[PDB]
C-alpha cells in the first residue's frame, strides 16, 4: 500500500493521514520514534533552508543593508562574525528557540493539540477552510523538500568554485 516504494506496505501505520505522505520511509524511523518530532524537524529544516537560500542569493547579488562590508555570501559569515551582529542574531534565534522548547515540550506530551511545526503566525486567513489548509500544507512541505536540495547545491557549488551568482 506504499506509494513511493510500491513493493512495501505503510512503513508503520504512522504514515496514514498527514500532508505530504507518500509512504517513503525505508529505514523505519517513522515507527521507531514519534512522528510529531520528525514532522517538526522536517518543517523547521525546510523553513530554515528556504530563508537560507533566499538570503544566500540576495547577498550574492548586491542587497547589502547599511554598513555591512560588501563581501560575497561565502565569506559573509566570517566577515559578520568578526563584525559582531552575528552574535546578536544568535541571541534572537536562541530566544525564539527557547519559546520553541516550550512549544515542542507542550506538543509532544498531552495538554496541547498543536500540530508539528504549526505555531499560529497566520495574519491573513489563507487557511480558514480545511481544504485550503491541506493545500497550503502540501505546498509548504513540497517547498521544504525542494529548498533543502536547492540550498545544499548552492552552498556546495559556491564552496568548490570561486563564486558567481549562477554558480556555473
Amino acid at each position: 500500500k506504499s506509494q513511493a516504494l510500491p513493493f512495501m506496505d505503510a512503513p508503520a501505520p504512522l504514515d496514514g493521514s498527514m500532508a505530504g505522505d507518500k509512504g517513503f520511509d525505508p529505514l523505519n524511523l517513522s515507527g521507531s520514534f514519534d512522528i510529531k518530532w520528525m514532522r517538526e524537524a522536517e518543517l523547521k529544516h525546510g523553513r530554515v533552508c528556504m530563508l537560507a537560500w533566499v538570503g544566500y542569493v540576495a547577498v550574492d547579488n548586491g542587497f547589502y543593508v547599511p554598513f555591512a562590508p560588501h563581501v560575497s555570501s561565502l565569506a559573509a559569515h566570517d566577515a559578520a562574525v568578526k563584525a559582531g551582529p552575528m552574535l546578536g542574531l544568535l541571541l534572537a534565534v536562541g530566544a525564539i528557540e527557547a519559546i520553541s522548547y516550550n512549544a515542542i515540550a507542550e506538543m509532544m506530551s498531552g495538554e496541547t493539540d498543536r500540530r508539528p511545526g504549526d505555531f499560529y503566525l497566520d495574519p491573513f486567513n489563507l487557511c480558514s477552510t480545511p481544504e485550503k489548509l491541506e493545500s497550503m500544507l502540501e505546498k509548504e512541505i513540497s517547498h521544504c523538500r525542494l529548498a533543502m536540495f536547492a540550498f545544499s547545491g548552492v552552498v556546495t557549488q559556491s564552496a568548490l568554485t570561486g563564486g558567481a551568482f549562477p554558480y556555473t
Binding site: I99, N102, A103, E106, E111, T112, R114, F119, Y120
Partner: protein
Amino acid sequence: ERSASIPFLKKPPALDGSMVGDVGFDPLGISTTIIELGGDLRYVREAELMHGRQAMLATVGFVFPKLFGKLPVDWAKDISLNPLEAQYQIPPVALGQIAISIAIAEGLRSRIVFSNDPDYVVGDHGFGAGMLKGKSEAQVKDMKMKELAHCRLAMVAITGMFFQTAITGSLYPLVD
C-alpha cells in the same frame, strides 16, 4: 486552553484574568509555581509596579542632566554624561539625606506591604489619590493599565540605556 499572548502555548492556569495586564504571558510558569506554594500574585505585582515606577523616574534621570542642565547649587561638578559614572562623584553629605529619605519611605511601605491586610489594593499606597474620585471601574482599570504599560516600557528602556552607555559611548538618537 491556550494563552492570548503566545497562541501556540497553553494558557498559564494561574493567569485566569481579573488582573491588570493579564494577557497570559508566562512561558516559564512563574505564577504556576507561586500559587501551588499557597501564595498569590500580590507581591510580584507590587514588585513589578515599583520596578516600573523607578524605571520611569530613571528614564527621566538618565536624560535630564545632559539634555537640560544641572542644579544651580554648588558641588555639581559631576560628569553630565555617564550617569553610571556620575554615581561615584556624589558627596556623602547628600547621599545621607537620600538614603535617610528612601529608608523612611521604604520602611513605611514595608509596613504597608508585609502586614496581612486584605483590603490593600496592590500599588494603592495612598500617595496618588487626587484624580481618581468620581470615576467608574473602567476608567480606573484603564488608568492602571496605562501605568503598567509605562512600567514595562520604562524597564525595557532603562535596560537599553544602561547597556548602551556602558558599551557604546552614549544613546544614539538623543546624545552625542
